[PDB]
Amino acid sequence: DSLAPEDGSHRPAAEPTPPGAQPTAPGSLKAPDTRNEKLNSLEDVRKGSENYALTTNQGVRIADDQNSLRAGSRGPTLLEDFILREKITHFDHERIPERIVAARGSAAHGYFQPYKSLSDITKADFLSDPNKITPVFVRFSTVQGGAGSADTVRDIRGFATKFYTEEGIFDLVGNNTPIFFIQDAHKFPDFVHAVKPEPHWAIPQGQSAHDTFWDYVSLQPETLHNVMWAMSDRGIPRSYRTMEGFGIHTFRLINAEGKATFVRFHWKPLAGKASLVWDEAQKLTGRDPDFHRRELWEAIEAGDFPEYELGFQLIPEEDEFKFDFDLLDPTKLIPEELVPVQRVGKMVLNRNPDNFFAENEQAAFHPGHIVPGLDFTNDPLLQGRLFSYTDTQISRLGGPNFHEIPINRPTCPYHNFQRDGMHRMGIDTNPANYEPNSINDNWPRETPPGPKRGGFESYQERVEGNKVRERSPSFGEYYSHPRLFWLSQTPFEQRHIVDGFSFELSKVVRPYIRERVVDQLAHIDLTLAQAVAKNLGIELTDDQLNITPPPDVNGLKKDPSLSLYAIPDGDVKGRVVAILLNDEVRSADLLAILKALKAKGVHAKLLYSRMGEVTADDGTVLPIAATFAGAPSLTVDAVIVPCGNIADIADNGDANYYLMEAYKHLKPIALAGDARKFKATIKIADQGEEGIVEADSADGSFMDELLTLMAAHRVWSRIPKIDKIPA
Amino acid sequence: DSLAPEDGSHRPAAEPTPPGAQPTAPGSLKAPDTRNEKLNSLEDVRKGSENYALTTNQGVRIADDQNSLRAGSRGPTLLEDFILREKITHFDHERIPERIVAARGSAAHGYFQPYKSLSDITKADFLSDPNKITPVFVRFSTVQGGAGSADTVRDIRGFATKFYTEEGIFDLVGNNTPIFFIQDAHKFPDFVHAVKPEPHWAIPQGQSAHDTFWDYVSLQPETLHNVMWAMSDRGIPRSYRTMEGFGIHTFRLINAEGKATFVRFHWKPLAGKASLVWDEAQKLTGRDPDFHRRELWEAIEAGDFPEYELGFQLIPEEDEFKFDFDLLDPTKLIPEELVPVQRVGKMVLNRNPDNFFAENEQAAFHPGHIVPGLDFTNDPLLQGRLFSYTDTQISRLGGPNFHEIPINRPTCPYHNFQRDGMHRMGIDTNPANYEPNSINDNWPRETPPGPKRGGFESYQERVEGNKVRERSPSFGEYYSHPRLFWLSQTPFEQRHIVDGFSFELSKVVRPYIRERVVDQLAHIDLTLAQAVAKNLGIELTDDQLNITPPPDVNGLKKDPSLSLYAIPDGDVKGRVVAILLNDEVRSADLLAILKALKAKGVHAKLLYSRMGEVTADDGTVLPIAATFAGAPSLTVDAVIVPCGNIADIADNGDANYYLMEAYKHLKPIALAGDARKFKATIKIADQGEEGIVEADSADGSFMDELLTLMAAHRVWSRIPKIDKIPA
Numbered sequence A, B: 001d002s003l004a005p006e007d008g009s010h011r012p013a014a015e016p017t018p019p020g021a022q023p024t025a026p027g028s029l030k031a032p033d034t035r036n037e038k039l040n041s042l043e044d045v046r047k048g049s050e051n052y053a054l055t056t057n058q059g060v061r062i063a064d065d066q067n068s069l070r071a072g073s074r075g076p077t078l079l080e081d082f083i084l085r086e087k088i089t090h091f092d093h094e095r096i097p098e099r100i101v102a103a104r105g106s107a108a109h110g111y112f113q114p115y116k117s118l119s120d121i122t123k124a125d126f127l128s129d130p131n132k133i134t135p136v137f138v139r140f141s142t143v144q145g146g147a148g149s150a151d152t153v154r155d156i157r158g159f160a161t162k163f164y165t166e167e168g169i170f171d172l173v174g175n176n177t178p179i180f181f182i183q184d185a186h187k188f189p190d191f192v193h194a195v196k197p198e199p200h201w202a203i204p205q206g207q208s209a210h211d212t213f214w215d216y217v218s219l220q221p222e223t224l225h226n227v228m229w230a231m232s233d234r235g236i237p238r239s240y241r242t243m244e245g246f247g248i249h250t251f252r253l254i255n256a257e258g259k260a261t262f263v264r265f266h267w268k269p270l271a272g273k274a275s276l277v278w279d280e281a282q283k284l285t286g287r288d289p290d291f292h293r294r295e296l297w298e299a300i301e302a303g304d305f306p307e308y309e310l311g312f313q314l315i316p317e318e319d320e321f322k323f324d325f326d327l328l329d330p331t332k333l334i335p336e337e338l339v340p341v342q343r344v345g346k347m348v349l350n351r352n353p354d355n356f357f358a359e360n361e362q363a364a365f366h367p368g369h370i371v372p373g374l375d376f377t378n379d380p381l382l383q384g385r386l387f388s389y390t391d392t393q394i395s396r397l398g399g400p401n402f403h404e405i406p407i408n409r410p411t412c413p414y415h416n417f418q419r420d421g422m423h424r425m426g427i428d429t430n431p432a433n434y435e436p437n438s439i440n441d442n443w444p445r446e447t448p449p450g451p452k453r454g455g456f457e458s459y460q461e462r463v464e465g466n467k468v469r470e471r472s473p474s475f476g477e478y479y480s481h482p483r484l485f486w487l488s489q490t491p492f493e494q495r496h497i498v499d500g501f502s503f504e505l506s507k508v509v510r511p512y513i514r515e516r517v518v519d520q521l522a523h524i525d526l527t528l529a530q531a532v533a534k535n536l537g538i539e540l541t542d543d544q545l546n547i548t549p550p551p552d553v554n555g556l557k558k559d560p561s562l563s564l565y566a567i568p569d570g571d572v573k574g575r576v577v578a579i580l581l582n583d584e585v586r587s588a589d590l591l592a593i594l595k596a597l598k599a600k601g602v603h604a605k606l607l608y609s610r611m612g613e614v615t616a617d618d619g620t621v622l623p624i625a626a627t628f629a630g631a632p633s634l635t636v637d638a639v640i641v642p643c644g645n646i647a648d649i650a651d652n653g654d655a656n657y658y659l660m661e662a663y664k665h666l667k668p669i670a671l672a673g674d675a676r677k678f679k680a681t682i683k684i685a686d687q688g689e690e691g692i693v694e695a696d697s698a699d700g701s702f703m704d705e706l707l708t709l710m711a712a713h714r715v716w717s718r719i720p721k722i723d724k725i726p727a
């Protein structure tokens, strides 16, 4: 019965469309023409559906999938209904354990390619040739919340890339900030328990704003650097496309001659850096908890492919000890003012998965998954990570054969003597399951290390020391990097940092914890410490006021690359504007608005007080994307109000509040013709005001001012005006 | 080390304290004197910590829990660090699969007691004597969202009670609405797949506002009754304390004489019925996703024990076919006007768990867990459920010995010949593991049924009919219950239902699904259909406008027990009031205010523009609980603004928005003396308006008036006034 509409409107066109234009869909149906080697290799397990009979898992066609088998139509269900039991059994067993950390994440397929050969510094096959493409799978995530938690929380973001190389899988498992909270992997469970929901009541979700987190931070000053990053606007990215990525640890690059080069991995977002503001972000976890997931999926459906530039910070082996911080300390960043990021390659994400569970939920990444040409270092955090991902994957994915789960399979060859385990897919025909063997003539065989296609051989680092459970004395400095980060932020980024600490500490119930954290802030910067202290009604002591600031990092008093906004990096493609309609829209304004939006690749969402349609003044029928309350200003980058019958929406509560929220969250607002009467709602300016575009009509000039503002992301100069606005 | 603050303020007082007064804590430390047989029976697995050495799981004391074992303090981590590896290993394996449905839940311990012996209608031991106390463990839950999703979503709520009786565990696994969406358990996976996040991208979380849900609903009219309940304010309860609970299915009570009586189970909230309004609820999922979990826990820490009255709808076996609907159809409710609820007992929830994971996460409820004196019916939804819980628990909880997980264990004896299985705790000494046996003289032995303490025997219901996969023709009526529900709601409740449907259908991207739902509503009631159509820009056709309404339900054109608010049942105890402070509060208003709230068990939270303290006019130091932005109006039931230096907060955007938000969400507002300056913020006339308490001071009848408003929960008459208002 229940079938598709005759018009065929149930199914999304298989071409790039803007967000909201068509129902989203599985990647292979949205873009059948988008391929890569990994994408094709999943064809063995893709399952269609159209034109096939509904069956059991054993392939028996089902006649009636609406009812259980019973004795009489009002009778008891019979034990012999095998169809019902298989159906209910599969359903009952759908869930698998979520990841211990990063349970909440959104993923996509894509490809990578180096800009030039890196064979002088590394023998890594995937970095050897500019025209050799490496398929990737990337998962972006939060850290604390569960898989059903919200996206736009304040938290670190994970940025894990699986490279399916010709010489093995390489997982670059990083975050959106260049350092981690702790130094040694042994304290991982401690740190994660402290930030996770408190054990008695399992509160709070997706938030570090609770006593245990701040307790731990107050007693472990090594966390202060990543805490600064987390409290800044870096903790609430606008999108996964507009954040940086970092491997955090110093790893090693090994060339064909055996030379080791220390390296730190970087991802540069080609859509630029951009973050939300706290109020927006918090409210957005309620209005659309799947905001980042959605925005990623829709950007890929629209052709706005998330693009990132892989970059390398390279440090000669001889310079290991030349900085004032240890290179192997993951709570320390390497300032770009000291070691520049060399551009390495471009990664493009151009296809969503088909089934989230099968591909995203079951994906397994591992920082230990390196290939010849890469090696580890003694970073003590990194070191414990090598152990942990392997271990957790055995229960999360039910056994040792998780590399056989389609998304995780290498696309290159893999042969060894490992056998059995739960859900073994591969059926080995090798007479031998051990080596050395003579019965299969010793195949598969070991391969000597070499310049290309050689077996893995660890870089022979010299190890000298006693067996000790001891932190390096060189790791015992906790305040200079926090201070370097603080001084590198613009004045409005600094204010946001203060507000993040003030908000969070206000949620800490035990007041002494707040004081200890303030005391820690006093060792970083007195201005910062005093601003937070004032917000918490706390008075710094005389001693606290005489704490000497930490030294500069190798002479640096600031590093502009640590700021999200000091250096303009503004790209509007992929952004989205709310267009607040009325029932007699000036079609001339609209045509002009969409033409300029379209030239810059900026999307629009047409909003009204109801759904359905409204007819413009020239008889153009405009489908409504959502209502003013249905898609709040939180979900867009700027708001445009075209002329027309403004009286239709002039007294609309939601339409007015729409602008007040957008204004409070520093977003550009453009008002044409009679739409300018809305300036009274945002009680501000009479002539004009920077951030508010106004004109008699929406013209070329009007749109260029708007797009220029959008390229600056937010109207920071309006900050002083917002705290009187009641919104 | 010795890190606690000398002063002992890290530890909350072990006595009832209002929400926010102390840090929350494990139940057994917070209320050590609150005991019951089940709580005392868990003492064997409770583990302390104070004054013990930190050890591995094998009991080896740990000297250094800050570092991994390495070769040299900057060297590589060694594989021989077994302390590191056990710690990380346990951490890596912390998670277990969340519940397939109802993953998000909040639980508490309590006790149950019958008002009188029910021996005449059931031989169930827990209902046989008013002095027989039964320990309970209750879990409240949402349905769709993961364990990390938000609490105040729009959804059905679960209300599961584990009764640890003397003759076996009895679990009553119900919901907060008296019917379910579907008729037969075979379609559970279909319905759940439809409401859960869509399979390509896993969006949206905790929400039925998406295409697949409404698609299913539009093709399966049986779902319409429960959809109406969910679309009403029933789907967004104020708290688990203020919602009704229901078993849904018709079960049987069996007395000692063998007589079977049909029964539907009810839970009446002794704190009354109360729900949020959609905008508040959605926003509250962002501002505090743990709001319900928190409120439950803090209610219990405060001594406001959630109390419910067990009630039975009883129907003689001869009246099975006397209604217009089938009693075995779970999409049909039994109108209380036809079959009153007889009061059976009281359940008081008076202690929080110690560890959420161990007690809450691992709790396994099952509607098939019945005891002698109860029995099932042929309800086809119930029939399938009996299979599902048993099955799901074997993977969720790792094996068939989940009844040995402390929280799930019976408090009464349990002996059988079942053996082994993962995680087997009981060591059986029985020489026999089979029966009949002579080697243990057949023990343990079967027990014949009898009036008390006898074996379970099913009621000998006559079964007659062919083995068919068929829906009973008596279940094929879908619109009359939906209509009865609709007509029983107040006008403001009806608008909320219209708004819930409109909002949700606005998020369905495929317009034809919206139209199809509208067509279904037009089969329920024309006013409902037209109002929703209008909000979606849909016009009903002339055929739709003449669909004849479904018949009344057995002569009833309304039943006021179906409304949340038609019949007052307001209880203010445990509610909370926001108090907006200034820097010179009139201390006399404050004494008056705080004492009056305290007298009715109404909590308060003193809010300001910063944390720390404020000093009243007489030198009284007032501790600030949170900022205006920190504990928004969403979290409180009412707002009071005392006299003082109002100019301190008059131009504070957050302070003004605080009142706009509370005013918008129909909450009582009380303004003392110069706090009447805020009247212009929320547009109140000089004369005043119903719902706003105002006077020169908080003396005389100011608090009694405010409290009368709080007893009626929300100011429904203000609805038309909120239409406009930019908030």
Ligand code: HEM
Pocket: A098, A099, A100, A101, A102, A105, A139, A140, A141, A157, A158, A159, A160, A173, A174, A175, A179, A180, A184, A185, A186, A188, A247, A248, A249, A330, A363, A364, A365, A381, A382, A384, A385, A388, A389, A392, A393, A396, B088, B092
């Ligand atoms: C530099 C510091 C770290 C970074 C950048 C980092 C990054 C990440 C990311 C991005 C994920 C999610 C991958 C996905 O999307 O599936 C993840 C998961 C995980 N992390 Fe790490 N992490 C760090 C430290 C650690 C440490 C110290 C440990 C334990 C010693 C650890 C144990 C885990 C585990 C067990 C998982 C779950 C993996 C799975 O279930 O497949 N992480 N981490």
Ligand code: HEM
Pocket: A088, A092, B098, B099, B100, B101, B102, B105, B139, B140, B141, B157, B158, B159, B160, B173, B174, B175, B179, B180, B184, B185, B188, B247, B248, B249, B330, B363, B364, B365, B381, B382, B384, B385, B388, B389, B392, B393, B396
């Ligand atoms: C009257 C209809 C139903 C009601 C009132 C109901 C209620 C509930 C509640 C309250 C829970 C969670 C208990 C907890 O808090 O642990 C739950 C879980 C569950 N429900 Fe039901 N449900 C209904 C229908 C069904 C049906 C028809 C099925 C399948 C045939 C089903 C399968 C499950 C499963 C598998 C779980 C998870 C339990 C676990 O992992 O322990 N439910 N349901």
